[PDB]
């Protein structure tokens, strides 16, 4: 009816329908017999959501896991779609995923290096895309848990040497640049070079020297943005133009804890309108200090790269939203406990003085500071009251980070496959190198078969066994071989009788 | 343990080598002092042989290697909090009292020293965070 | 021997062994 408007079905309906659904760079006489037709029917099957037919016209699919995800986005688009729930949900059981994941494992276990190259692939069947395109596109998070998915990312974290290498070792060859010559440390001065300065992980090392760097020097500099006769020094406009630039320079390309990531943004420019102003110099102090912690912040979720970090700080951002509100109400406890021993222990007249004496000195007493030259010229059971819900505190997140922990683990796997192509895509150079790789590119811009279709081959013959498989041990169910065994004895005994 | 037993066997020798030195008397010292609990940290082993006691130092053992970047992570935050504090709180020249004044007093806050008299002429949302920090650290062990 | 599956198996073939035959 649009297309109608704009000017019941046609070619190029149909295949506007799907530019709306897979949303990749895809597009498109009756009599003519249409290439690969088994791809067609497989699709109008999901469509149609004929799961059987849908398996069936698969089983002679061409390339299994590239039609498999690309029909689990399809069905994950509908199931939201449909306005019959009950409908919605029996589309929302389709799992191909699963199948995905089956016929990749298997290509897996037979090869892992013609399956890596299957997975690192361009499916003309889908306008030459690799799988990977499709995974982030029907959002794979259970696929991307797969160890072939996890062995590729790590295979092209390092590039040299990528199963073994020791931390230890990796860090002292890289402080001398000629540890790769030397052989020490496993890898012609130019290419050597490339190849120790081009690889993820070192770009990954790289930026990490930097920001500490930068996180230190700016602490430092912070001393003398203390106390200068105007607010601002000339130091803290040296390291601003040095690094800020920079760093916003990369986010807003990249995009032309995220609560974490807009107060960090937020605070920087913050802190730059207070310096703009000399006249609050208190408060062109005061933002910038408050604004200061957010590079650390920011650094902490960068903690998430190797094994044992990693679910870590995923569960960090679990609990992070719940805690809040518990916080305060904690708070307001402890600040009616305050407001109470002050009243009681003594019958004032300042702002400043009466909110220490109401916040500090009790928060202090927490902290093994008691002053009893002040405090000392029920409350045993409101010391154990304190303890009891301290102890609900404590058993609270002792006991709701073990559950989400399953599924953070996957979701930590997901995280650092993000990390890991986006360090890929990060220009190596550090924030200010960073300046001279972004002029070097913008200078720029100024300026097989038989192989695959082996792998095709080989794949199918995959599928095949394992479906053969999958047959055979549907045949020797034992309850199913029982079931028909009572049958048949029923049937003997009609026939004896 | 092995680690342990190549610093235990290092810092020895090197507690002779400067005892043979007499110009660097602070050094003959601090050098010994650094030694002396290599052995206490050696009889700590030493202690698996009975049943009880057999596993734990074992899974003493496991932990050994991933507490390291924690324990580090978890002092530049520590780190980074007290020089927070220690800015906002006051406006120097001193490299030892710098030092002091940024590193022992926060340390020693933890610890139940509080010198208000040197202190006192968002920080909630601060403690809340440790706390909910130090959570994290102890689920990270306890699990 | 005694290993209930397998016996269950076997006695199942049995089965269809003696029903083919009545049959």
């Known amino acids: 009816e649009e297309g109608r408007l704009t000017l019941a079905f046609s070619l190029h309906e149909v295949s506007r329908v799907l530019k709306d659904f897979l949303h990749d760079a895809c597009r498109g006489d009756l009599s003519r017999k249409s290439e690969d037709p088994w791809r067609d029917l497989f699709l109008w099957a999901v469509l149609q959501n004929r799961y059987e037919m849908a398996t069936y016209f698969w089983a002679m699919g061409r390339e299994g896991v590239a039609a498999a995800l690309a029909a689990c986005k399809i069905i994950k688009e509908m199931s939201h779609l449909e306005k019959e729930a009950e409908v919605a949900r029996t589309m929302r059981e389709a799992k191909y995923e699963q199948l995905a994941l089956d016929l990749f494992s298997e290509c897996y276990s037979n090869s892992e290096d013609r399956a890596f190259a299957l997975l690192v692939r361009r499916n003309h069947s889908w306008s030459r895309t690799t799988c990977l395109h499709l995974a982030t596109e029907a959002d794979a998070k259970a696929f991307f848990a797969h160890d072939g998915v996890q062995a590729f990312l790590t295979k092209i974290w390092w590039g040299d040497m990528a199963t073994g290498t020791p931390i230890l070792r990796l860090l002292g060859a890289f402080t001398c640049p000629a540890l790769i010559y030397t052989n020490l440390i496993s890898f012609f001065l130019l290419t050597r070079w490339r190849k120790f300065w081009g690889a993820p992980v070192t770009v990954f090392l790289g930026n990490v020297v930097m920001y500490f760097a930068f996180l230190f020097l700016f602490s430092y500099v912070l001393l003398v943005d203390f106390r200068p006769p105007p607010q601002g020094p000339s130091g803290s406009e040296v390291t601003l133009y040095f690094w800020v630039f920079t760093l916003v320079l ?90 109470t021993t002050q009243a009681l222990l003594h019958p004032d007249g ?39 819900l301290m102890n609900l505190l404590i058993a609270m997140f002792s006991y709701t980070f073990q559950v989400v ?62 479906l053969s498989t999958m047959e055979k041990r549907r045949r020797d169910s034992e309850e199913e071989v029982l079931r028909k065994t009572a049958h048949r004895v029923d049937l003997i005994a009609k026939y004896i009788g």
């Open 250 to 339: 990369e986010e807003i390309r990249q995009g032309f804890w995220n609560k974490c990531d807009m107060v960090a943004i937020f605070l920087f420019i913050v802190g730059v309108t207070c310096r703009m102003v000399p006249s609050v110099f208190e408060a062109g102090r005061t933002v910038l200090a408050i604004d200061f912690m957010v590079f650390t912040l920011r650094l902490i979720h960068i903690f998430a790269i190797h094994k044992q970090l990693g679910p870590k700080i995923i569960i960090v951002e679990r609990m992070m939203k719940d805690v809040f509100f518990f916080l305060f109400f904690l708070s307001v406890w402890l600040v009616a406990y305050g407001v």
């Open 350 to 388: 300042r702002l400043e003085w009466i909110f220490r004496r109401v916040l500090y000195r009790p928060y202090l007493q927490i902290f093994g500071q008691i002053p009893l030259d002040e405090i000392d010229e029920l409350v045993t059971f409101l010391l154990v009251t304190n303890v009891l």
């Open 405 to 466: 922990q399953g599924n953070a683990d996957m979701f930590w796997k997901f995280q650092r496959y993000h990390l890991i192509v986006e360090y890929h895509g990060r220009p190596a150079l550090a924030p200010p190198f960073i300046l001279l790789s972004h002029l070097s590119l913008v200078l720029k811009q100024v300026f097989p078969d038989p192989v695959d279709q082996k792998i095709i081959t080989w794949e199918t013959v995959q599928k095949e066994n394992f």
